[PDB]
Design a binder for these strands. Sequence first.
RNA 1: AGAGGGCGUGAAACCGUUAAGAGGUAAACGGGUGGGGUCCGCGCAGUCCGCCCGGAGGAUUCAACCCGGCGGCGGGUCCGGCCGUGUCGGCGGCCCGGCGGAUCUUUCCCGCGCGGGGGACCGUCCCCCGACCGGCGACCGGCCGCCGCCGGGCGCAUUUCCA
RNA 2: ACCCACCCGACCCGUCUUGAAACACGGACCAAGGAGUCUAACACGUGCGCGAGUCGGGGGCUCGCACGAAAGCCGCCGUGG
RNA 3: GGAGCGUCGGGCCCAUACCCGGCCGUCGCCGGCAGUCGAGAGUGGACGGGAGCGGCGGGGGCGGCGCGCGCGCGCGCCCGCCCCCGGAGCCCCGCGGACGCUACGCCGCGACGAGUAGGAGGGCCGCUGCGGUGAGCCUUGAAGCCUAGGGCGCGGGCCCGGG
Lengths: 136, 147, 225, 53, 128, 187
Amino acid sequence: SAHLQWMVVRNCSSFLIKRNKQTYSTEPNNLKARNSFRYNGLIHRKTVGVEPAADGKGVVVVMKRRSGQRKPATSYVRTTINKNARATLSSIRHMIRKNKYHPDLRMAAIRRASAILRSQKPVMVKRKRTRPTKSS
Amino acid sequence: PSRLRKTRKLRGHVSHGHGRIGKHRKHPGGRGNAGGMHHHRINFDKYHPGYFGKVGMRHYHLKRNQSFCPTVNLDKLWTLVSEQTRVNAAKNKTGAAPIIDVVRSGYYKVLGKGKLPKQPVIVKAKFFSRRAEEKIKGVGGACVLVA
Amino acid sequence: NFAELKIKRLRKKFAQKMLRKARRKLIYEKAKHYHKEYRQMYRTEIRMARMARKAGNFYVPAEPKLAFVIRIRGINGVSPKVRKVLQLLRLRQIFNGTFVKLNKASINMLRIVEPYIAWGYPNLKSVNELIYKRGYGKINKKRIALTDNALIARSLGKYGIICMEDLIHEIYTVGKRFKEANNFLWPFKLSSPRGGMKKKTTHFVEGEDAGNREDQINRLIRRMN
Amino acid sequence: APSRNGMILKPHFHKDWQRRVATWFNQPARKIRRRKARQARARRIAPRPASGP
Amino acid sequence: AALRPLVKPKIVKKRTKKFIRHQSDRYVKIKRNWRKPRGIDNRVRRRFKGQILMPNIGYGSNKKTKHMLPSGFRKFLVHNVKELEVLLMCNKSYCAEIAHNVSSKNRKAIVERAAQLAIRVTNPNARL
Amino acid sequence: GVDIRHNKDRKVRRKEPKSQDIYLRLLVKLYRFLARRTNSTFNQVVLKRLFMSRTNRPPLSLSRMIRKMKLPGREGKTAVVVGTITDDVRVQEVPKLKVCALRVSSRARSRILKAGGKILTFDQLALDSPKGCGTVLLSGPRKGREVYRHFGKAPGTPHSHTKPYVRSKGRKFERARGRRASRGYKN
RNA sequence: AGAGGGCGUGAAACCGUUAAGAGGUAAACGGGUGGGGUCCGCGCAGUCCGCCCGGAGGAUUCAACCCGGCGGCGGGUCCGGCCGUGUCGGCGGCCCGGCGGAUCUUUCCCGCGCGGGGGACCGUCCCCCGACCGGCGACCGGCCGCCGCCGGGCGCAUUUCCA
RNA sequence: ACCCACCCGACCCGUCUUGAAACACGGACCAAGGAGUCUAACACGUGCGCGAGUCGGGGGCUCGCACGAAAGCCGCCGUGG
RNA sequence: GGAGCGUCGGGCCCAUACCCGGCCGUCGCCGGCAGUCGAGAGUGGACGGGAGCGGCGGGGGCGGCGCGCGCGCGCGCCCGCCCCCGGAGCCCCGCGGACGCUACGCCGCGACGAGUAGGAGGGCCGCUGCGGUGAGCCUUGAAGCCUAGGGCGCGGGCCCGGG
Ligand SMILES: [Mg+2]
Ligand SMILES: [Mg+2]
Ligand SMILES: [Mg+2]
Ligand SMILES: [Mg+2]
Ligand SMILES: [Mg+2]
Ligand SMILES: [Mg+2]
Ligand SMILES: [Mg+2]
Ligand SMILES: [Mg+2]
Ligand SMILES: [Mg+2]
Ligand SMILES: [Mg+2]
Ligand SMILES: [Mg+2]
Ligand SMILES: [Mg+2]
Ligand SMILES: [Mg+2]
Ligand SMILES: [Mg+2]
Ligand SMILES: [Mg+2]
Ligand SMILES: [Mg+2]
Ligand SMILES: [Mg+2]
Ligand SMILES: [Mg+2]
Ligand SMILES: [Mg+2]
Ligand SMILES: [Mg+2]
Ligand SMILES: [Mg+2]
Ligand SMILES: [Mg+2]
């Protein structure tokens, strides 16, 4: 099941990382990096995962089929969205809400995408803001 | 697992759980079963009634195999045989009654605890109880002595 | 489906609001009666004496039913018979108090704890001030402040006691249902006596604070409540 | 000294027994050695039963 | 213009000084590190007036602001870049410490990545 | 300062099972929920028993389960046992039963199913009856363990019948001064 | 050589000095403030950001829509077929289904009343199709609805970017 | 958190003791070392497996052991406890 | 002419005691939450005929069980409707459900907290080695050492800066 294998995994997984009074989890398709039942990519029959695009521009959503897990090669199905921020969110929203897929997730999936589109903020602009650089 | 044991948690504390009025000295009672009569008597005669004293007859060269006589109760006599002897019987219509060699299964005596199902038998055994005999007859069977 | 249910839910809503109104009105009239009852009690004690005094006579009024009992010394070095009675009056901490109905049994229990308590016959006002300022229910064994009558009712409403006012009338007149209203009240945690005491260790009669001071328990109440 | 209920029990560790403790760390090495030696003896008694007589 | 945390309440501490160990002052062999005394007579262990204090759970921090740095964050000791990307979805509540043992080349690699993701770093201007 | 004894303020009952096994712990998650959300006290009793020790949930023999359902009226029901169902070789004819158990031994399983019996797991019982309706909640004999024969008024304490811890029974292991009248005295 | 032949690292006790501070109730300590130092964070305004909105400037293509393609989800008609649970029918695998049995038979066979193997029988495990039911995350195929991506269409009261 | 000042508080620890700041003992200072272990037997508690059974030893069959002196299996599965 | 003694007033002084409030922990609550109405709860809902301003014309009770935000109603026009959240717009929503849900988690209410000998629990306290595991760290500097540098933790301790 989901729950059974969460019992096996909850405290032992290689992906987990305690330390410094927090805990985290590094398994893929965990938006929110939580060592939670809810937010765990590997356990659930239906899964969401919002990674950045390898291009450096844009976001990828990562659904999981249901067709056939057992066959991880075919299980996840990726989809780049490289659109005008506000649009990107909405496409993710619909993917999640209007497909009735992992409805629990969804707002977390939006915030992730949002943060990713923040990431691709401008590094040069940040440098200018921190230091006035006036009159030596 | 020392990790789990008590001395890890006693570290720091002086007496190590043995108190500081009285201490952990070596052998304050005497070693072992010392004082069975004097000064440990009460424990002996309120948890071991009858430790001290002889009783009964000596027996010099005891050999246990002479007195070997493992028992079995009617309770579970049919257990000795395959269910399909107890089934091909309550059937058959000859009034046959299947044999149960108890000595084959490793019991010499047949004692008589328990209800025996109304279903004839021939019990071969080295020894029988009185009651075990009676019950067997009441089922409509026959006890059989064997050497 | 939809508009039928909605109206049914609105109907329900209203039937509650009506009932709330009703029970409120009962509470309001119950008080008004108790106002008249205490008035009538007060006057008709004076009435009596004046009438004895008109004749060459005396009106010995009733001995009191009910008394407040404050624990006025601490919890160290206290005899086992005292200590037990003090935890049969629920007077565990120092300066805890309880109402206590009087009778041969009860009075003698106070006699066995005399130099450990100050006590006597509370006023009407005393019963109000104690209940309103420091009225705490025992509600599933959790000391809980009587913020609403929904608390009192929930617990004591099986006796006809449905509000703070009813409670005050049960305590003060020592009704049938006193035991159950009095036990419902968690014992009164009062502060220290402002202006101080006279002497903790000696009896009232002989200058101190302990023992029966009858009328004068009300002064002490005000300086502690 | 005995304390409230238990078998009034006699252990036999009064002689110098730790001088004569016999460990079994051999045993695997032993078990093999027998087994080799066994297979050798077969091979020597060529078509004869390994058993014996 | 540094990274503000989500909520920056008033941390309020019950005790600021270190509890120190009895007679750690008098002797170089005794270390400051707290030890409960277990001595049969002991001014300290029996709570006399005027002595060094004994730590209780009484002094405990408020749970909202326990482990809260002055800045408002909690630390999280990042060890390499991959380990940062965890904090991505916290950033407003946790910051990143970089480890002592991390090299001055890849110390740099972490810092700029945290700057993309807006995770505040607690020892950035350092190795150089 | 207040006078209460803080002596028996902490109740010592279990809360969870002490075991770490994952399947039992799932049953606990299920029956916690049911316990709290249903009115059924069956769920509460069952929940309570899932936290108990091996000792404390003794095996229920098939014959004991038979006779308890043979009782008049509890017919067309389901027997429930938080322990295990074992065989009785000293019973023969096994009626067709309905059973819940955390375990049933392989023999006991065969015998029951051969009869036309149904065996249920505890997750299955919940779906079948979440408020424990139409159940016979049994238990194995708690005081079966040979352990208990040493418990009580000590041996050598008049009118006790309490097995002493003895290395080996036989002519000359106890049965002298303090059991015979001939040797000192007897209790 | 801040590794110099008892030389890797080089703690503490203890000593020398350099700098700072103090000094008649032995010192040292707890609590509480003050003063001074040491560094650390600033600010050469820290007025901190983020949504949405209104106005004002500037800039790319859209979104809304259809059209073509791909991928995904979910659905019932269980429609068609694969899939498997409980039941019933085939006694059909039963010898082309094996093990087990103190069930039987030495009508059998082989080896010497016994051993091995058949042969009955019972228990257990497998084929054939039909019917009912849980139609079960155990899958496919079409159809439907919805979503997303790519490309077509749409050139600008739109949809974006930026200040 | 370094130093200094001041007000209040404040006897030296360890220990045996009814009682220790004691005119009771041990202690100049620092470093490293330094004391409830293991085996056997019992009992109770708890966890797991199987359950009228259970069991593994001892022995054997599988390997030159890289990991193995492991791991696996045994009409020995039960002589036997 | 008390700062003495005996008798008595007011007033004021402060303990870790009492009261109110904060914060930490422990205990208790058949505690709550795996996603729903509902605050002395004292029902909800088919569905069929007969009808309608009818209703259920019961206590100075002072009242809880029955009444004045509607039951039928505004719209389509005496007859019909009284409709669907992929949209009632929401203080309750039974169609789907946390920002919250490491269920060894999270949350709420009360109460309480001296301690030798002794017992038990928890230690994301600490040391050394082993199986796993961190696509860990490390000559672009590991361990150790030192530090009037910055912090965290009630604490065991820990983490960073510089050397
Ligand atoms: Mg001890
Ligand atoms: Mg000692
Ligand atoms: Mg002793
Ligand atoms: Mg006193
Ligand atoms: Mg006195
Ligand atoms: Mg041989
Ligand atoms: Mg002492
Ligand atoms: Mg205590
Ligand atoms: Mg060197
Ligand atoms: Mg050197
Ligand atoms: Mg070297
Ligand atoms: Mg100088
Ligand atoms: Mg002595
Ligand atoms: Mg003496
Ligand atoms: Mg001393
Ligand atoms: Mg002296
Ligand atoms: Mg001496
Ligand atoms: Mg000396
Ligand atoms: Mg050392
Ligand atoms: Mg045991
Ligand atoms: Mg305590
Ligand atoms: Mg102690």
